[PDB]
């Protein structure tokens, strides 16, 4: 009976002084905004219904109109920043935070979902949700001995809504709010459900994308081992965020990078660097480039896990983006490595696939590959084997490539002839 109503009819019912008539129009509004295609969000906003829906959130004696109003307002906030702003401008945020204490779980869950859409718009509405005090009652819903006693969808919505209060930068989430949520976010990272685990890895990915002090807050909570275990999940939905967070922790200090290597992450990279998903390969090759930029003992740990042959293979065959992250991992390694390590890279077969990428267009990769050729030729000078390296490059067809490196970029043809003249 509340199916395919007109907006004028929903307006006539909500404009009535009958809460039961207002409930049937608020349910007809939810049904139109829950339709699979072209939800009429703008027509409902132009009708002036958000204010009446926000007052219906306060109707404790009509739990049905509160649920229907929360669903309708959740779907308007699901749309454009403009549509989410019309919900926040109706006074919705305080009203959704009261509904978090609803004895009805279906109404409390819709208030969680709504808040998630408001905070997901951006940092300003994320920070206004946090200012209106949403965190304490969100975290109170998860204050249970066993998260397994809560409904799957309820925990999945609460975990996605907490993820959105940990998301967006400029500004980044408030440090006090991040330290109030992390303890509960860690409990959800140890949960059995895969959607809760995926949205909990994304939240740690958002909190790790930032200055080293933000990375430290998370690494002090002891999550790196659980993130390294979720990096080995068979579910790409959990591996994609677990890798981003491990990758964002190796942007920090060599001591933070050393917690990842200590948790055993280098043992999963053989499969992440051979991953059928191009994003996982590229993201994992980028994580390897920030590990090769660290200490010589950390570069030796990469060598011990057998990852150099795997980086020679991403350089041999992979999406050019992954191959550019591999050139960067080889130049960082050849920059901070010992000579014993640089000669191991040439023994693993780095010369041919590195040189074959000098026939590419990007000047950035050409400047990176020629910066690694010099570092290797400098290690060869310290061993008196530059001639052998020159002959090896000549046979792979590299001197020919560097000879052609007649280029627009100066540093390119400058370094090219700095190497052609000095070693060839």
């Amino acid at each position: 009976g509340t199916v395919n109503w007109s907006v004028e009819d929903i307006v006539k019912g909500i404009n009535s002084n009958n809460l039961e008539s207002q409930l049937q129009a608020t349910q007809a509004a939810r049904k139109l905004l829950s339709r699979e295609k072209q939800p009429p969000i703008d027509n409902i906003i132009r009708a002036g219904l958000i204010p009446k829906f926000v007052s219906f959130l306060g109707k404790t004696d009509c739990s049905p109109i509160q649920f229907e109003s929360a669903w309708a307002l959740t779907n308007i906030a699901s749309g454009t920043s403009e549509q989410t702003k019309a919900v926040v401008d109706g006074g919705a945020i305080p009203a959704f935070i009261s509904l978090l204490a609803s004895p009805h779980a279906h109404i409390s869950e819709q208030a969680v979902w709504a808040l998630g859409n408001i905070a997901g718009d951006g940092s300003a509405f994320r920070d206004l949700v946090i200012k209106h005090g949403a965190i304490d009652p969100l975290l109170a819903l998860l204050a249970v001995p066993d998260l397994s006693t809560l409904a799957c969808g309820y925990l999945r919505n609460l975990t996605w809504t907490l993820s959105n209060l940990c998301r967006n930068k400029n500004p980044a989430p408030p440090l006090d709010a991040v330290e109030q949520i992390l303890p509960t976010l860690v409990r959800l990272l140890h949960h059995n459900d895969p959607e809760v685990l995926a949205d909990s890895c994304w939240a740690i990915s958002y909190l790790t994308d930032g200055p080293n002090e933000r990375i430290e807050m998370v690494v002090k909570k002891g999550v790196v081992p659980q993130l390294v275990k979720l990096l080995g999940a068979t579910e790409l939905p959990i591996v994609t965020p677990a890798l981003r967070a491990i990758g964002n922790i190796v942007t920090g200090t060599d001591e933070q990078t050393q917690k990842v290597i200590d948790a055993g992450a280098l043992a999963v990279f053989p499969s992440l660097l051979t991953n059928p998903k191009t994003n996982i390969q590229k993201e994992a090759t980028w994580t390897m480039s920030n590990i090769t930029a660290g200490r010589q003992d950390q570069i030796q740990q990469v060598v011990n896990h057998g990852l150099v042959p795997f980086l020679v293979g991403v350089l041999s065959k992979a999406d050019f983006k992954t191959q550019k992250e591999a050139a960067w991992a080889i130049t960082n390694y050849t920059s901070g490595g010992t000579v014993e390590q640089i000669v191991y890279l040439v023994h693993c077969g780095i010369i041919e696939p590195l040189m074959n990428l000098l026939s590419a267009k990007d000047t950035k990769i050409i400047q990176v590959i020629l910066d690694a050729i010099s570092n290797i030729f400098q290690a060869a000078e310290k061993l008196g084997e530059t001639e052998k390296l020159s002959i090896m490059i000549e046979e792979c067809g590299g001197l020919d490539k560097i000879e052609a490196l007649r280029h627009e970029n100066e540093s390119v043809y400058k370094a090219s002839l700095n190497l052609i003249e000095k070693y060839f």
């Binding site: 905004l33 829950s34 339709r35 699901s78 819709q110 979902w113 996605w160």
Partner: peptide, 7 residues
């Protein structure tokens, strides 16, 4: 990310 509740 935002999520519309459908059906």
């Amino acid at each position: 990310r935002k999520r519309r509740r459908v059906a």
